[PDB]
Design a protein around this ligand. Structure first.
Ligand code: CL
Ligand code: ZN
Ligand code: ZN
Length: 62
């Protein structure tokens, strides 16, 4: 019966003909983003681990 595109990260759903690219754009909008290098992560990626990534850009001296 699945007549819609399910977002995998939230509860939303879309017309089955919903602009693929716009849908990719939706999905991307949940991702966490490193403010220095822009790497992206699952929204639920561990916050400690995530912060450690950011910090490393500094600790390292880029
Ligand atoms: Cl740590
Ligand atoms: Zn979503
Ligand atoms: Zn980064």
């Amino acid at each position: 019966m699945d007549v819609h595109k399910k977002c995998p990260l939230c509860e939303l759903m879309f017309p089955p003909n919903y602009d693929q690219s716009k849908f990719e754009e939706h999905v991307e909008s949940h991702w966490k983003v490193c403010p220095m290098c822009s790497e992206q992560f699952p929204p639920d990626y561990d916050q400690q681990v995530f912060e450690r990534h950011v910090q490393t850009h500094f600790d390292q001296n880029v």
